[PDB]
Amino acid sequence: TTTMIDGIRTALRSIGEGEISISAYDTSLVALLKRLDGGDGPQFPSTIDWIVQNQLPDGSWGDASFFMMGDRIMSTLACVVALKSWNIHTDKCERGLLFIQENMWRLAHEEEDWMLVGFEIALPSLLDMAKDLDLDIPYDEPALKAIYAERERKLAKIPRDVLHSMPTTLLHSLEGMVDLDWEKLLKLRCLDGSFHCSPASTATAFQQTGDQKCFEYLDGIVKKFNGGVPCIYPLDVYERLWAVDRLTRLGISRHFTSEIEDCLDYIFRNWTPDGLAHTKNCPVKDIDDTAMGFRLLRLYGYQVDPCVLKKFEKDGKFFCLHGESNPSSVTPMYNTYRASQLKFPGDDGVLGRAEVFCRSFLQDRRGSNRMKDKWAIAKDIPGEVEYAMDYPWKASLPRIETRLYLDQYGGSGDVWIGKVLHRMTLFCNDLYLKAAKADFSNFQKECRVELNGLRRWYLRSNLEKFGGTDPQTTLMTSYFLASANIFEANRAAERLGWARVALLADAVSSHFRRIGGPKNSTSNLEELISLVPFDDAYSGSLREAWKQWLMAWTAKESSQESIEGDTAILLVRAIEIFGGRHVLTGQRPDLWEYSQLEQLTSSICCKLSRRVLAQENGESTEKVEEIDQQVDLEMQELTRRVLQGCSAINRLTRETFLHVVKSFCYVAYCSPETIDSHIDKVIFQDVI
Template identity: 55%
Template sequence: MRSMGGGEINVSAYDTAWVALVHDLNGGDAPQFPAAVDWIVRNQLPDGSWGDAAMFLVHDGIIRTLARLCCRIDVLEHARRSVRQGIPREVLHTAPTSLLYSIEGMVDLDWNRLLKLRCPDGSFLSSPAATAYALQQTGDQKCLKYIEGIVTKFNGGVPCVYPVDTFEHLWAVDRLNRLGISRYFTSEIRQCMDYAYRHRSERGFGYTWDIPVKDIDDTAMGFRLLRSHGYDVSPDVFRNFEKDGEFFCFVGQSSQSITAFYNTYRATQLAFPGDEVLGRAERYCSDFLRERRAAGKLYDKWIIAKDLPGEVGYALDFPWKASLPRVETRMYREQYGGSDDVWIGKVLYSFFCNGTFLKAAKADFTNFQRLSRLEWHGLKRWYDRNNLQEHGVTLQSALRAYFLAAANIFEPNRAAERLGWARTAVLAEAVASHLRSSASADSVREWLVSKLTSDSCDKQPREAKNSAENRLLYALDELIDHLALGSASDSLREAWKQWLMSWPGKGSEVSREGDTALFLVRTVEICAGRHGSTTDQKMSIQKYSQLEQITSNSHT
């Protein structure tokens, strides 16, 4: 991850064949790139074809093999469809479009005009096949330099697209996040995000930073990751992919892509108030994906994934704001295809995702399962010792509280926050249940508030457990002492007092979910050490006010 450079991607027999077809530019009969010819010879399969030995696909092998045999056929359906469906040949020669990626399938081209549309590295949209064809036809030195560089880098063979630096930086971070192991790569992820932020554009992202044709897939991934990592990015970039009430992946596309709109839908989940374009994109992508799911057509033109319908279905059924991170990780582990994933461009080739990531995620998940079992047994003993069942809290409810805490805060070094959340949620339910059943709920609440000061709690005799209220106060006092030390204890007591004082009163129909959610957020912050003394908390209240408002908003 620290040395990605232009990205690592598997060699394509199809593109290597086009490079091998380039004759000596000085007029001889020998190949200009003998290393490419050598790669073709060394990588022929036992049946005489070329293709992916690990995944046999007839059309893949035929296309690669025909390219090797130098048959001049137009196999590039994307190029033909794009010309038919709205990109005139004149546009091909005047503005960068995705057609430049497939010019090896076209004839009667005006090379004087096309050469002006090259990328800064001399390639045509980073396509070795297209660039090799241009080199055949023109002998252009910039095209030559590009091909020479990648032939050397990949030891004779070439991939079907290079570089893919932006794509690889973004997707590597996304995979680490979704597999739940990103905390082991914090510095590397920061480097990737800094790289993406430096190379962002008002027109969006492409698979490499300087490619002139941007797409909504890379743009959505870049926007979502940058915003979720705290970078200031504008959603206006999505306006570049909107026309007449619809969104598209890139100009001149022949059909819509499931994965492109799946990633765009994920990006829209991070909308801020006022992000109108994200609201429109969310509605469009949601309708599109739901329609495809209902029709059983959740397959994509770019990748063959292990369980794309499962990924899309989870995103639709459990939006980001309602998803539990560890549950999402567990689901994604089953959906993740690792080295079995392939991307269909002009040919099929193995996706870059390293199986090592998946192995690390499995090991991490196993370790967390062991840790969570130990924590749950400890929580259960605490539940039994304080006889919380007496106060209306079932063991199932306690297990649910721990599950919610562990599904959101799963890092081993955050046990204090996780257990602080779970125990506070359980005890808050016990207090709420007691108040609801008490004939004098208001007086009991006021009594608990009056006792929640350091002095009064110190004076409370630990053996005075002759009433339900005293037993609850004892459990509360013990929990606060267990979760926090020093000034943090004062912050916890203040949080409990505020929660109790917000009690709506007996018989009220007002929902408590927002107040309790805010209370749990404050508890987690205090257990994590991010809330200092009561004085410090008051000084930084504006810093947390927006987060707390969002947390307590029942519509969020």
């Protein structure tokens, strides 16, 4: 119903600097800082109160929806050391210490990459702080020795001055780091004095330098939460992109266009010639957010250039980090290859290079269980990434994608890896499922009835007097092609018109093939168009377009012409007439653009038709590859012409062309045994 939509809208108008689950680990360090003015106790007890409030039934601390030793142990350690250092509420320390001691051994049995960032860097400092309290603690553990060895390895791996000159990710986790400067390192924080926007690093920093720039930041965050802090703040750009991405993939973006373009222009104003980070001011930038923003901004008529990607290339390779070549995960390259589809022909080839590198890197590991990310856990990655690597941009239909994603969006059941298991709900909410699924279900139920309506219409016209193989399957497929490009209820007019004239042209093409052609013509077929229920105004235009199509049928005879582009042009003209829209006065650029679009459509149709023709003759595949490249070029070109926010022509008028061409390419790029499958899944196979 609507209430979900309205709540989501109002919550979406209220985009703050961030919405993430409040962490406890960092709060514990916040408690460790005393009162500034030589006070008697800690700086802020609100954190303390928050801590006492949320003692687990097993005394632990952390998200209950999951169970992770490496994180529970650190949360418990930080809490117990904080409260007992300040020597208060010792009973809770006792309550948790039993679980601590009895769980001390489970750590040796963890997963491969489920290893928190600097996890082996804080834990040493953790037990160090502990040995001042020095309770009963089995410090004796080979796991401790292993992480110690890795500590020494990475310490021998890191420089001193490059570390003191070049701002790197290590500044995110510097508290477990020692043996440092405070002036050469002083300037390597963010615009707000935060080091990598992480509160723990800055808190430990202020512990050794009273720069008010850190105090004001922390005070603001603790004064905006009143007990509790996250592990990273803020995440404006991150959530901004990641919400609109879902709302596009969830097929509900039809309603929130205003707020959508609001966050869009925000990102645009904050766009850099160098890349993007989770926040506006973080100097170090990564590739994944950059690519995602690139894709989304292009997809809405914003002029950007992709040579910014020339920073994440590594001399014939690509690595998500700028300066670090570590084995990347699936998601960054996934979004990269995705954004690598909408290439405009006037752009540098770095996009193509990244595309081929990415597809190579992905297809191999696809067959195995390599879909495990190092920094997030979702419901089902493999299916999504597989379909993505399967159905290119030119063969993508919106409804089938949203249907597939309806079982691949996890909602709340996800977690995000950081220094602690955190989760965001602003865009990982679950009411999104209710809204989208209700919408899709009613949409299905509407398509179901209009289907039978069209069925009885088609039977009334006795069109099978010159039918095909069987009218049922083909009429189903035809109406499905229309329904898949337009799902809004208020356009069933254009929907049914499309389907009807499609069936018509099919029938007459069949009849013409069966008799040989227009030399064997006998009947007045320019009246056959009347079989469509006509309005008062929509009559004459259609008959004119129909006679035009017939004249084309005449002229295309005796030659080696194809007969498809004619049909596509007829289709777009008719869809427009049914949409009841005109063009304006027609300054020369306007009709120039129009004719350009039409010529592109006709050419593409002829080309891929001939390709299919050769495909059926067992032709040598190299020819198929040649023709595929050929259609690809003008495909990209047409897309660029449709996606220009500077166009003088209307928008819907543009996307119509896309609808038709995508329909044709799709139906020309799959066996029916998949088409019917998709058909039943989207129509008859019901949700909820």
